[PDB]
Design a protein around this nucleic acid. Structure first.
Lengths: 115, 134
RNA sequence: UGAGCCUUGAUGUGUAGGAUAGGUGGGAGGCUUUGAAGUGUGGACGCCAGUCUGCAUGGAGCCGACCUUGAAAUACCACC
RNA sequence: CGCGGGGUGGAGCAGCCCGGUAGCUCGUCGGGCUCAUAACCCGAAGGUCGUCGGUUCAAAUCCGGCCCCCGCAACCA
């Protein structure tokens, strides 16, 4: 299956396929299906790629895929040009929220590096 | 063990001794024993071994009798296994064909080659035995 | 008793593949109650696998040009 | 000059013949065991093999070129 987004959702439970789509969370998946009205408890028969036509227009109201990524990039480049502490952690690959660097900061710094 | 076809082939060819082209090609023409036309298979061993890299030979030859353009490349055991043409071709013409291949082989020989260039020259058909050429 | 070397059989296990695909060429015919795969069976390479091999049974079928696969039937002829 | 041998992790040594993608020993660094140290144990890193070509599906491996070292033999402008 395909959606308005560039990435293609898998053929399976409709809610799960949307969670996988970038930019759309499980809760946002439920938001647009509430507007679309397509539930999984309806007749499974008569299901086609034509049906997601309503999905194409309603998802477009939410920034997703490349649009969100562009937003993330502009937010981080601004941080770098600002000279703020928040930007500096981004540059050095260090925690950006105030978590301890002494220990338990592996996700930010990366694999262990010998002295 | 050996079948009647194979024992009569080895009865027709006594490969333990060498033969001259006139006799060898007569044996080859009498060795022509199959439902389908066979092709001459060359069996020439070179004293030079392509085991030395620089001694490798690549060559080509156009035959007026035809098989008419043939190519050849030496293997690792330094042996030549080409085809001069079909068996029904006349013996004298086949003898000229192999002779031209041999003259091109002398041109192909490198200087680095040490010892006899052509250690032995032999002929065989699809199912025929190897007859030495002199 | 060592080496050269003649001859006979035996012996090759990187692997998708069926498998125990060493190098090349001719190469869809070899083979065949005078016994096809295979069996009993005795050993071999033994890597324990593919084959071969004293005799008998089986009563005619085997290798396939299908796939796989640098590379093909490795059916058929020689050397290393 | 001829013939033979050698160069592979910091170092040393295999693997080479018979090509199947490269190990060990010692050292290094981190951890463990112990009151502590050694020994020992575990994990990690390190060269794709003196170099350069050829061959091949594929090269430390096979064949050449070159460099250095060594052994023996050879050398009457």
């Amino acid at each position: 299956a395909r959606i308005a987004g560039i990435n293609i959702p898998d053929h399976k439970h409709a809610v799960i396929a949307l969670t996988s789509i970038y930019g759309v969370g499980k809760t946002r998946s439920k938001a647009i299906l509430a507007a679309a009205g397509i539930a999984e408890d309806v007749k499974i028969s008569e299901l086609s790629e034509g049906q997601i036509d309503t999905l194409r227009d309603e998802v477009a109201k939410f920034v997703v895929e490349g649009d969100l990524r562009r937003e993330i990039s502009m937010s981080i480049k601004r941080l770098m040009d600002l000279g703020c502490y928040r930007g500096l952690r981004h540059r050095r690959g260090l925690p950006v929220r105030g978590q301890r660097t002494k220990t338990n900061a592996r996700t930010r710094k990366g694999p262990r590096k010998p002295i | 063990k050996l079948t009647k076809r194979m024992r009569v082939i080895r009865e027709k060819v006594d490969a333990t001794k060498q033969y001259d082209i006139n006799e060898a090609i007569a044996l080859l023409k009498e060795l022509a024993t199959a439902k389908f036309v066979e092709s001459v298979d060359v069996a020439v061993n070179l004293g030079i071994d392509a085991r030395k890299s620089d001694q490798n030979v690549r060559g080509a030859t156009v035959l007026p009798h035809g098989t008419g353009q043939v190519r050849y490349r030496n293997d690792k055991n330094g042996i030549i296994h080409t085809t001069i043409g079909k068996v029904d071709f006349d013996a004298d013409k086949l003898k000229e064909n192999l002779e031209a291949l041999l003259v091109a082989l002398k041109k192909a020989k490198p200087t680095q080659a040490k010892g006899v260039y052509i250690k032995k020259v032999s002929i065989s058909t699809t199912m025929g035995a190897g007859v030495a050429v002199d």
